[PDB]
Design a protein around this nucleic acid. Sequence first.
RNA 1: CAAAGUCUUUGGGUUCCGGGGGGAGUAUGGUUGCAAAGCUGAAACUUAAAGGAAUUGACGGAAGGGCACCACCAGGAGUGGA
RNA 2: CCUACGCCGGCAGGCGCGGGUAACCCGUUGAACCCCAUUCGUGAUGGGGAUCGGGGAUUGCAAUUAUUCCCCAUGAACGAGGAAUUCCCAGUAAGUGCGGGUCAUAAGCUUGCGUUGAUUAAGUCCCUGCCCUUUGCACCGCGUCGCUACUACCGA
Lengths: 192, 118, 61
Amino acid sequence: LFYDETEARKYVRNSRMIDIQTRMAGRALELLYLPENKPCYLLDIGCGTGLSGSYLSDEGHYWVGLDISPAMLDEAVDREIEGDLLLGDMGQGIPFKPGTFDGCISISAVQWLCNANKKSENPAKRLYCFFASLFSVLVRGSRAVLQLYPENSEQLELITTQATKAGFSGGMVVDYPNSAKAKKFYLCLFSG
Amino acid sequence: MKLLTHNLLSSHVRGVGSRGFPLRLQATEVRICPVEFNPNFVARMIPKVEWSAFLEAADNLRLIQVPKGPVEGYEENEEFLRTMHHLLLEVEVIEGTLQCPESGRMFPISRGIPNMLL
Amino acid sequence: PIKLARVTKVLGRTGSQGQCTQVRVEFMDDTSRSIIRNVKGPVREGDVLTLLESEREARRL
RNA sequence: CAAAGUCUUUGGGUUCCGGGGGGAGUAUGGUUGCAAAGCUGAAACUUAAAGGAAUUGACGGAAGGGCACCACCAGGAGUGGA
RNA sequence: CCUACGCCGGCAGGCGCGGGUAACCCGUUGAACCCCAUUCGUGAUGGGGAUCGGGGAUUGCAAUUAUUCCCCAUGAACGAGGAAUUCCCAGUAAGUGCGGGUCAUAAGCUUGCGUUGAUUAAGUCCCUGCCCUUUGCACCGCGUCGCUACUACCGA
């Protein structure tokens, strides 16, 4: 466990956090060619307090948000969200029927799948379980864009390899890559 | 928890999966929350909805006011589309239960989040 | 069960940064069952640890 | 390599057979065979190399060591928030 | 030009009066935090003082785009900061002030000094780097049509 009520509140109320999360969500939406210029249904993965999910609502999207933290969800409740919030661990799978969502988005969250604290399956197993179920719950030709924070290049390669084995194709977009203070990795994928 | 979300949600048990949909629904509490009316979105939801599972979840929640199969059109019949908006988008479960009839497990929805953990 | 135990040595610093000090373990139940375990932090020769259990041991080979 | 020697200091007898590499053992014809295929066997054109022995230095996605808080761990102060 | 001392300025500053071309005179270089009492009492409040409106005094040819300093009034954001990241082994880091330096005034810049004084470990190659040693694109299962023109076949 990582967040509490105090820390979830301080994160969601910080103006600097709001601005950066909003910029990365809007960049993820620009990279999401499937919702870009289209209406869509969306899954927001690691939705937190709904800072990314509010910006999906701004473009007229209907969305479901998944997060593992109660306190992040409880803080989301008071923010007048239009999305459905669900308490859920993404590493156990995506619990929707095949072909439910046009797209999926995740901002600042999937690097937690490399962490082995919460559960006693390998991160490698949970990573496979995430990508294989994520491929299934997406429509055919659906898209997934994930902004994420990798600790090293091995973590990037492992994430890419698991997405590749699950049936995704696409690549990695690295914005501002000459500043390792401000650079951001976006995983940009599509299903078959 | 909008009613529509019922159609995109299933039991997380590895053995029930991929047969674990739909969950059977009971609501201890409900609310109507105002939402903007979009006929085009409702009509573009129809091709992503499992209609058989839609009727069953409505029946479980005490509603037979639903067409027998999926519908079609130019969106000019506001009657059926406004009734679909009212049901799918505007009725929210606050408190309730989600029972899978294959593993026997009952998951809760509480203010107003469905939880799919063991 | 709670098991207090004597420290005999410090074999090396196992781990990825030099962070698990390596300790041969006598028991304080006077039994000569000298299991070698791993600790985190400074231990000098002649200390005494609180092994939570004696079943789960450190890696041989 | 004891013959792959006695070969420009080039001749003991004698049979088959090779003339850059592809096109090609393809065509086409003859011939044998029940058949699959075997034997004999082109050319048009294309290309400046294909090949045979031996012989050395960079990259390792190759492995071992060794050092460093302009590395990590344990942590402090933080910056990045206004 | 460094100042002491005295006088006049509610506060910045003037006026008179020496030492000092320098361990001497400023200098015993009389500091800040710290401490002991007072008030406040957990909220945008007396925290934070930004952002400005009136003035006042110096520096100088020249202050208007506020030079700087002072005196009222104004009182925003900020509730311990996300991804990521810098520096850190004992008088160390960190709190905290004093002098040099471009120099007319100009000082959150830079360059030392002292005061208060910690946590943690004294290990390692995983991450980051750095130094040595050894070692050495053959191939297989991208296609559909259209009208016109041209080359080479078969040919009633």
